[PDB]
Amino acid sequence: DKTVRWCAVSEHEATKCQSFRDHMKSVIPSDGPSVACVKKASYLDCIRAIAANEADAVTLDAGLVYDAYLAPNNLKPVVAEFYGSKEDPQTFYYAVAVVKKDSGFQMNQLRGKKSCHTGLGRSAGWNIPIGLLYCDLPEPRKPLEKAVANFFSGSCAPCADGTDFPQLCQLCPGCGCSTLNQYFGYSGAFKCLKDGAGDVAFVKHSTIFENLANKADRDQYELLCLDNTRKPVDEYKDCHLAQVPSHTVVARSMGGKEDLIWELLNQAQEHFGKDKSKEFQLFSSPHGKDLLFKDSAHGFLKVPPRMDAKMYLGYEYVTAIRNLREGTCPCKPVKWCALSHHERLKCDEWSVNSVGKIECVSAETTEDCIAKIMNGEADAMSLDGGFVYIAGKCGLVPVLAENYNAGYFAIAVVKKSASDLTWDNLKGKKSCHTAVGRTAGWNIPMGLLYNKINHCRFDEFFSEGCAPGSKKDSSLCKLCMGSGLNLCEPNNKEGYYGYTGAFRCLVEKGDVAFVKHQTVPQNTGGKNPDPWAKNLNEKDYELLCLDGTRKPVEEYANCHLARAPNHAVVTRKDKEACVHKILRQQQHLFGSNSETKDLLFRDDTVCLAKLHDRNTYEKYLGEEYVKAVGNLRKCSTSSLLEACTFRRP
Ligand SMILES: [Fe+3]
Ligand SMILES: [Fe+3]
Numbered sequence: 323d324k325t326v327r328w329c330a331v332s333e334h335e336a337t338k339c340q341s342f343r344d345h346m347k348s349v350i351p352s353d354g355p356s357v358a359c360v361k362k363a364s365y366l367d368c369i370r371a372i373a374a375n376e377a378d379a380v381t382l383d384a385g386l387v388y389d390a391y392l393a394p395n396n397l398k399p400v401v402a403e404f405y406g407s408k409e410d411p412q413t414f415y416y417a418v419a420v421v422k423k424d425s426g427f428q429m430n431q432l433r434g435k436k437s438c439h440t441g442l443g444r445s446a447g448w449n450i451p452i453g454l455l456y457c458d459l460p461e462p463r464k465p466l467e468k469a470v471a472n473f474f475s476g477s478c479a480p481c482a483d484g485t486d487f488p489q490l491c492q493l494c495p496g497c498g499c500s501t502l503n504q505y506f507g508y509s510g511a512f513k514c515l516k517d518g519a520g521d522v523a524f525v526k527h528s529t530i531f532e533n534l535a536n537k538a539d540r541d542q543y544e545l546l547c548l549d550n551t552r553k554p555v556d557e558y559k560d561c562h563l564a565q566v567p568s569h570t571v572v573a574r575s576m577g578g579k580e581d582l583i584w585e586l587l588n589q590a591q592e593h594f595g596k597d598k599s600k601e602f603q604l605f606s607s608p609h610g611k612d613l614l615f616k617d618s619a620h621g622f623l624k625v626p627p628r629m630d631a632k633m634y635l636g637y638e639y640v641t642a643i644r645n646l647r648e649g650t651c652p653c654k655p656v657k658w659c660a661l662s663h664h665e666r667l668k669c670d671e672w673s674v675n676s677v678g679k680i681e682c683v684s685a686e687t688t689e690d691c692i693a694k695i696m697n698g699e700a701d702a703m704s705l706d707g708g709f710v711y712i713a714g715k716c717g718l719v720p721v722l723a724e725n726y727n728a729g730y731f732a733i734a735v736v737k738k739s740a741s742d743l744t745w746d747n748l749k750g751k752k753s754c755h756t757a758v759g760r761t762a763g764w765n766i767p768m769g770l771l772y773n774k775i776n777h778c779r780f781d782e783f784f785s786e787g788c789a790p791g792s793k794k795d796s797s798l799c800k801l802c803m804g805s806g807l808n809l810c811e812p813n814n815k816e817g818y819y820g821y822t823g824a825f826r827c828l829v830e831k832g833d834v835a836f837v838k839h840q841t842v843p844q845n846t847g848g849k850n851p852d853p854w855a856k857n858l859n860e861k862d863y864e865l866l867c868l869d870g871t872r873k874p875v876e877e878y879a880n881c882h883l884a885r886a887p888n889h890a891v892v893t894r895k896d897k898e899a900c901v902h903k904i905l906r907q908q909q910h911l912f913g914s915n916s917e918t919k920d921l922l923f924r925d926d927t928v929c930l931a932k933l934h935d936r937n938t939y940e941k942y943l944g945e946e947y948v949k950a951v952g953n954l955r956k957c958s959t960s961s962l963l964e965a966c967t968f969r970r971p
Contacts, residue, residue, distance in 0.1 A: 329368035391631030401571035416527035417446035419546040438514030438523040453642030457651040527558035564639040659691035659703040689962040707887040714939020716966040720890040724927040729888035731839035753787035754827030767836035769950030778957035839878035
């Protein structure tokens with residue numbers, strides 16, 4: 323059977339679920355998904371049922387999505403309710419901290435201020451703010467209301483115990499837990515700020531726009547960011563305390579049945595969704611409100627499959643809630659991300675030589691490493707410019723660049739014999755790329771080549787090639803040299819992967835190689851002893867310049883496609899300051915003063931530079947690069963980038 327066992331937490335939810343079940347059978351062919359209605363006492367019993375393989379799916383709030391993920395349940399998000407409507411599906415809400423312009427403080431200065439909360443136990447209003455501020459709270463931090471009452475000088479915390487902690491109702495005496503209180507609710511908390519009662523209001527990114535219709539009024543307010551700066555209120559996407567998902571269907575991490583759950587719900591919304599006018603309505607019921615799904619929902623979106631819970635909730639939210647539940651308070655060692663066996667051992671004795679200042683975490687892919695940096699499992703790692711872009715869209719920032727001497731050059735290399743080749747028409751020719759998605763091998767070359775054909779389906783412009791990372795059936799995987807599962811894979815077990823592998827690809831079967839400027843010289847004249855390169859001379863190879871001419875290899879300065887942003891270290895903004903510092907020390911202690919090739923960093927790197935003002939993926943790579951990458955993402959297959967862009971379209 324292709325049955326999805328849906329978990330209800332009430333008799334009304336069960337009744338609607340049974341109706342859901344019956345109407346599906348009139349709509350879905352017998353070879354398709356069906357529904358079964360398991361009923362439990364609570365969302366946690368549902369979570370446990372799903373993990374115990376007694377049910378498959380339930381819809382939860384962000385707090386429960388965290389519970390569902392914790393061991394031993396290990397559930398993940400698979401489908402997302404969206405709101406607003408089809409044009410612009412709203413899946414998340416942002417918890418923000420609104421303040422008045424020129425009030426002169428930031429998040430790390432909230433102690434002593436007057437606070438406005440939507441209500442005790444509420445999320446944007448209480449749980450999130452308090453969870454981020456937890457370790458700033460005075461001890462003892464239990465009971466939490468007492469700690470909060472000894473942190474802000476006075477507050478309006480609706481439904482707080484004003485009798486034992488009157489500070490929490492100074493701005494709304496009695497702490498009224500109803501709209502009878504003027505400072506209650508999302509709109510009430512903002513009023514507490516607007517009226518001058520308080521200095522900050524913990525609400526949602528939308529509260530302000532729903533209570534002030536004119537931009538002139540809104541310009542008198544700002545948001546507190548966690549980097550201890552401020553931004554305007556229409557920039558909440560870059561200045562919030564947490565990005566929270568409104569309503570999320572969860573399922574087993576292994577054992578699914580993600581694919582059926584989506585097929586079921588996708589066809590459910592197509593026949594019974596918003597404004598479908600049937601006897602049965604997926605987003606309402608006469609039996610009660612918000613059964614199975616929120617009544618205000620407009621449809622379902624499929625959660626990208628790379629997404630796990632910690633990634634879907636986000637670093638900030640997870641930090642907040644984790645603090646409230648564990649209650650554990652503390653520059654601490656940098657946890658570096660290693661991608662392979664050889665990289666790991668190099669890291670391991672970097673950790674021993676460091677006397678603790680650097681620990682080592684290992685993952686199997688770069689994107690798995692970035693995911694660990696995002697969610698806290700790891701801290702830093704060095705990345706090609708094409709991966710810092712991905713790391714940027716995912717919320718990370720660059721802390722340091724690799725200097726080898728403005729960075730390295732992206733050159734297109736050709737065999738001198740074949741002298742018909744010019745940059746102006748390589749159409750129908752054999753191409754060699756380091757890997758799809760990287761500066762020299764793809765982003766720059768295919769960036770420029772995107773402008774002159776107006777599309778990124780490059781397996782049709784070129785005849786064939788090796789671009790490790792393309793779908794293994796593509797014409798840009800036919801020249802690759804890996805055997806078995808390694809054919810065309812973007813790692814070492816594909817011989818044509820990397821700067822030099824792409825040049826080897828040119829030597830043995832390609833017509834042009836997109837590569838850095840030091841690659842040909844460093845792999846010719848016997849400098850590389852492996853048979854394929856040992857007897858090569860760099861004079862047999864030329865570079866294609868953009869004007870349309872050709873030029874020898876060692877005068878790349880006048881014959882390059884563009885300047886390439888240097889590789890860079892990336893981390894979370896909440897560790898930018900400490901990763902910079904740890905590393906620079908570890909550099910004049912182990913710098914220019916890898917056992918195989920280029921572990922952790924490229925060994926030709928001489929020092930790690932700081933960027934001053936270019937600590938953003940947009941300001942480090944430059945506008946013309948991100949514009950190019952933006953054009954090539956249309957044809958990109960990066961599952962991690964698909965997850966991060968789901969959170970930030
Ligand atoms: Fe709420
Ligand atoms: Fe690179």
